[model samples]
Every structure is written in structure tokens, then in C-alpha cells.
Target chain A: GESPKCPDILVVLLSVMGAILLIGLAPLLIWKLLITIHDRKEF
Target chain B: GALEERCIPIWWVLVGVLGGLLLLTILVLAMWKVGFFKRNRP
Candidate 1:
């Protein structure tokens, strides 16, 4: 029988980290995009 | 079967972490360029 240890935990850990990063950064990202567009329109 | 059980190599995880960090760095730079954190300074 094959008894290879699955990478389930590794995947879950990285996925959670990625999700948190995206959640934490999404606001800043959108704000930057907004500012860039705003600046372009004013000039 | 031996072929049924599979796992990713540890290097792949390292690569993923590095990639994530790179993405984060790029985002931070973009925010800085847009002056996202400089609104309160004179």
C-alpha cells in the first residue's frame, strides 16, 4: 500500500496565507488604482 | 497503489512562498507610488 504523506497541510497553510494577504492588500490595491486614475484625469 | 498516493515536493512550497512575497512587494511599491500613505504629511 502506498503511504506517501499528502501535502494537504502545506497547501492549506499557503492558501490561508495567500487569502489573508489578498484580503489585507485588496483595499490598498484598489485605493492605489483609484488614485492613479484620479491623478490622470486631473492633468 | 503506489502511484495513487502523491505529494508535492518541498521545493514547490518554497517557490510559492517566494512568489507570494514578490507579489506583496510589488503591491506595496504600487501603493507607495500612488502616495497611499502620505496624505497626513506636509
Candidate 2:
């Protein structure tokens, strides 16, 4: 997937990047949830 | 790749997405650092 990700030309690029970061962090979030449940012994 | 043949010109999508990312980062820094805007409320 050779998509052209131009990080220039927009004023809100930071926000978009943060959103993308959060989206990418979804997997890590799942891990955190599992850890919390395991430590508490309940969901 | 798919839009390359649609003839709709998708540059604007890139612009909007980038714009959103830029704004979010600003917000994140402001909240994360607990500085400037957040502290100015006092």
C-alpha cells in the first residue's frame, strides 16, 4: 500500500495524526483491558 | 488505488485528514502536558 501520506498542506494534521495514533493503539488498549481484568479478578 | 480511476480527485480527503490530525495533536499536547491552556484556567 504505497499511499501518499502528505503531512503537509493542512492546519489540523496533528489532530489527524493523534486520531490515527489512537486507532493504532487499539490493540494496546485491548491488552490493558485484559491486564486490568486479570489483576482485579473481575471485569 | 481505487480512487485513481474514479476521476473525483481525492486530494481534499488528504487535506481534511491531515488537518484533523494537526488539531488533535495540539489538543493532546495541551491536555497531556497540563500546561498553557489548562493551567491558564487558574
Candidate 3:
């Protein structure tokens, strides 16, 4: 039987970083836009 | 009101950060799903 091993640490780190950006960034931008629109409505 | 009118609760800031951290954990799981991390698990 064969066992699994993580081949490259570099790719591992890169994908983790990319995924972080993918999940976190869009929501941040959307949240910022929502706040901007809400604030704009007042003034 | 606080007179400035643009007021926010500090706890909401914590909520935002915690929410970000929650999703951040999800991405780490995806890295494992790719068979790159903790590949020995069943």
C-alpha cells in the first residue's frame, strides 16, 4: 500500500495564501461598499 | 447620540475580524482538500 505525502512546501504556502485572498477579499470589498453607500445616504 | 452621528459599536469590529478568521480557516481546509496537506487522513 502507498502513503500520501505533501510534495512541495512552496506550493502549499502559495495556495493557502491565494485561498486567503480569494475568500477574504471579495467580502471585504463588498462590506466596504455597503458602509460607503449607507454613509452616503446620510450626507 | 455622540454628536458626531457616525458612530459604531466596538464589538462589531471584533465581529468582522472573527468572521474573517472563520472563513480563513475554511481556505486552509481547501488546501487539505487538494491533497497537499494532511494527505494521510481517511
Candidate 4:
């Protein structure tokens, strides 16, 4: 969402939103990743 | 029983929505990274 040929508001918005989202989803993502890793290792 | 639906829990939808949103956020991030960062557009 950054402007054309420039990284300003777009960069800021993307970074902030991404950080917030990643943090919020970290728990579920970690849980899922751990489960997947465990399952693969079990095989 | 009507209680069965209630007992089934609602976290699934909430989790699903959150997961979807996370995915969308990922797409957005990738777009920004690839389009803005990769082209040396920074």
C-alpha cells in the first residue's frame, strides 16, 4: 500500500499492520506449526 | 438438543476468522515486500 516509487505511509501501514497481525496470530501459528512438526517427526 | 449447538463452542469460527485474517495479512506483507522492497523501490 506504499505510494508509487516511495515507501512512506504505505510502508508504515504495512509494517504496523503486519506486526500487529503477526503478534496476534503468533499463538495459533506456533501451536499449528508445533503440531505439524510433531506429526512429521512421528512418522 | 438445543444445548448441543451451544456446547459445541464458537471458538472455531473465531479462530478461523483470525487465521484467515492472518493469511490476508501475509498476502499483504508479501505484496509489500516483493513489490516495494524487491524492486529496489526502497
> Candidate 1 regions off by >4 Å?
A1-43, B1-8
Candidate 1 lDDT, A1-43, residue by residue in tens: 2443665756745875596578658887687577667766655
- Residue range A1-43, candidate 3, lDDT tens digits: 0221433444444455556566776775576567666656665
Misplaced by over 4 Å in model 4 are A1-43, B6-8, B36-42
Taking all chains together, the TM-score of candidate 4 against the true structure is 0.36
- Model 2 error, position A22 (Å): 1.0
Q: Evaluate all candidate structures by whole-model CA lDDT and list the values in order.
A: 0.65, 0.53, 0.53, 0.52
| Better lDDT candidate (2, 4) | 2
- In model 2 chain B, which range of ten residues has the least summed lDDT? B1-10
Best by TM-score: 1
Models ranked on DockQ: 1, 2, 3, 4
What DockQ results for candidate 1?
Answer: 0.17
Candidate 4 per-residue C-alpha lDDT over B1-42 given as tens digits, one digit per residue, 9 for 90 to 100 = 344333213454345455557776776677457653233321
Over 4 Å off, model 2: A1-9, B1-42
Q: Residue B1 CA error for candidate 2 (Å)?
A: 24
For model 4, what is the alpha-carbon lDDT of residue B21?
Answer: 71
TM-scores for every candidate against the unseen true structure: 0.47, 0.34, 0.35, 0.36
Q: Compute the DockQ of candidate 3.
A: 0.03
> What lDDT does model 1 reach?
0.65
